[PDB]
Enzyme design. Sequence first.
Site, PDB file in Angstrom:
ATOM      1  N   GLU A 174       0.897  -1.204   0.296  1.00  0.00           N
ATOM      2  CA  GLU A 174       0.009  -0.251  -0.489  1.00  0.00           C
ATOM      3  C   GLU A 174       0.483   0.967  -0.392  1.00  0.00           C
ATOM      4  OE1 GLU A 174      -0.946   1.061   3.877  1.00  0.00           O
ATOM      5  OE2 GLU A 174      -3.255   1.531   3.036  1.00  0.00           O
ATOM      6  N   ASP A 219      -9.470   1.787   6.374  1.00  0.00           N
ATOM      7  CA  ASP A 219      -9.583   1.678   5.449  1.00  0.00           C
ATOM      8  C   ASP A 219     -10.687   2.603   4.902  1.00  0.00           C
ATOM      9  OD1 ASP A 219      -8.442  -0.591   5.768  1.00  0.00           O
ATOM     10  OD2 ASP A 219     -10.006  -2.096   3.963  1.00  0.00           O
TER      11      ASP A 219
END
Length: 374
Positions: free
Chosen positions: A63, A256
């Site tokens: 990420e 998230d």
Amino acid sequence: EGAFYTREYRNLFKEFGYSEAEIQERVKDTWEQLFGDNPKIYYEVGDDLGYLLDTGNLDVRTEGMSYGMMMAVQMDRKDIFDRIWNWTMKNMYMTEGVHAGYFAWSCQPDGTKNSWGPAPDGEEYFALALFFASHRWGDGDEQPFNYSEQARKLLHTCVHNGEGGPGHPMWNRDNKLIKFIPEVEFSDPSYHLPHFYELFSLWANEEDRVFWKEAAEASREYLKIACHPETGLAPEYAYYDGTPNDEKGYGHFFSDSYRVAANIGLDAEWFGGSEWSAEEINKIQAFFADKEPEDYRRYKIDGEPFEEKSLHPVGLIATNAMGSLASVDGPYAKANVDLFWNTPVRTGNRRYYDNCLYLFAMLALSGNFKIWFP
Ligand code: NI
């Protein structure tokens, strides 16, 4: 119409009253705090390696590496881009196991893989960042610096894995939705980047260009059912049917989820606004209008608060502000951008996630998160 067509990016900070000089200074300062030599989330190793450190978990994640590459290409820093991509290919790319062809999601700073499982949101950012690198600097002669080939190869795996092996694709071929991970049949709203898929429909292998167009449309429709109709809040994980997957606690509005507003804002800027997107951002901002950052909590998507505080309030502020690109005339758009301007980057061992979201918002709101064409 979106910037994809006009080739002109909205500088929302400027439209909201901030001076060009102060905006330029603020964007540069944000970049320097993160990528400069001040113990900062980017670390240089030797003369050809580098990585973004999840300062809080003491590991390197796809990420972060993919985010770093995207940031570097947006900033026209090929040296940093290559250092990160080189580290990624050397330590994260998997040649063995069921996920061969994908990138180990978490590695230790020394390169050791902590898992052989990938994180789809990393792969999609790697792919677009690589296409942008190819377009800005041209494909390199020596691998893995042949950017566009790397991007097309990776996306091929993401769509076709499993046809010639025990592997699995990162997108469900029937519903065209990105998955949370290759071996499960559910998703993660924040992973949906229709604006990225639109570009993949132009640059990926031709045999998959129709698929990518369908994925963009599928993701836009999915976001409509994943976001709560009243609060606009989306769960971290969600089944394909749109409802939250709380089997392991990821069915609420938390870490998230914050990226959903940011993604909606960038898609609106790149490919055009929409009634749904403006209304969705207005819902989220309306929900937080009477809430203080210091009091931000984990919330069920219907708005019910948990005692637990947000672990990344600065990141939440940044994403809500970036969302304003999808509702520039919204009742809380200006307030959110102002709040973000008045919020310093996070300090401490857990600055990583918040600051990545922070820099993306600084780039997008200043008209510097662009599409780089061939
Ligand atoms: Ni100044």
